[PDB]
Write a protein that binds this ligand. Sequence first.
Ligand SMILES: N#Cc1ccc(C(=O)Nc2ccc(F)c([C@@]3(CF)N=C(N)OC[C@@H]3F)c2)nc1
Ligand code: NA
Ligand code: NA
Length: 381
Amino acid sequence: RGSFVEMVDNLRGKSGQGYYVEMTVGSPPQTLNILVDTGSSNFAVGAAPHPFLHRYYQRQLSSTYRDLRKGVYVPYTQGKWEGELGTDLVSIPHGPNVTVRANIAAITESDKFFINGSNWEGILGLAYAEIARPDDSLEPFFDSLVKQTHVPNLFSLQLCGAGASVGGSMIIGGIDHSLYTGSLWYTPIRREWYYEVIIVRVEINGQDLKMDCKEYNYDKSIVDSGTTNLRLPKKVFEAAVASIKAASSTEKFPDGFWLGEQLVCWQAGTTPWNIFPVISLYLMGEVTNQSFRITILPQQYLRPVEDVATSQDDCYKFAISQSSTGTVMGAVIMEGFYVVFDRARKRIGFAVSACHVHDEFRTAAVEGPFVTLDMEDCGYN
Ligand SMILES: N#Cc1ccc(C(=O)Nc2ccc(F)c([C@@]3(CF)N=C(N)OC[C@@H]3F)c2)nc1
Ligand code: NA
Ligand code: NA
């Protein structure tokens, strides 16, 4: 409890390609790098020689592989994979010292799923059975781990961005106190499917968007380490960029930029962070009529793009985007915070990350309590 030395710094990644952890599957163990995704619930690994893959799961080499005689076809908005279901022995070498028998979907065909030039070969979906494919009877990894071992039913994530290569920590079974500063503030998980939460107020530099808060959660809001952007419901995105545009009007940007349709560039070491506003989400708290507020900086929502062959300046992408799936607190939000997925008490904790990217004037912030009435009105049905 509170001290997990062996698990600190156990994530790696490249800017734009997500955070992965090393896992082993089968006997003898096959090492694979696996994307950590709190927005899905399947453990799915490449199992055929796709040319983007450094390596892949070779079921023939494993004496412990048990076939489930069942295929699965999984399309997403972007891309798709199909695979064959089975179970095998799984471990996390920089995670707890245990081996579990888990469902694995051996990916045998995929489109627009793997990233060319990335270093991972599968995804670890850490959300709940209700959204597992093909259905909720395919027990997700984390449920198998807690069912079969003494590992406590929680995990926490510190995702560290950069300004090159990313890193961070996934602490499985506890919280490590050196990963954050100040206090953890907790928000209820509204329903265990995605890690769904309820946003109760949104401010852009302390000015409130002043929308029916049902708008912030239409049709859900979720915490999701497998998406880069902060995604906002269309109506709220419209309000938010208009307010951010206005706060930054000391400089002008093409309109394409606010749509994530073009990048914007400054002379190296001259990004004007100061003209961009902080953005605060207030989340439903643990106590009736109580909320707390998280705040992110332009450093989280302006993402550097390197390997840009138009020019060799400092080029950024606006990473707040409109959504048709509700609010998505991706890496744009998580990179500011230590986030504790406290599945045993159905709640998510936030604290200021010990590693977040900041400057001399502003840091990301987690502050409470605030008095907010009618917070139950904010959830969408
Ligand atoms: N930061 C960051 C970051 C960059 C890339 C990636 C990435 O490629 N993720 C990724 C790639 C392929 C995926 F198919 C997913 C899924 C799998 F379910 N998971 C979520 N949650 O949303 C979309 C999709 F449903 C995520 N993730 C995080
Ligand atoms: Na247990
Ligand atoms: Na601490």
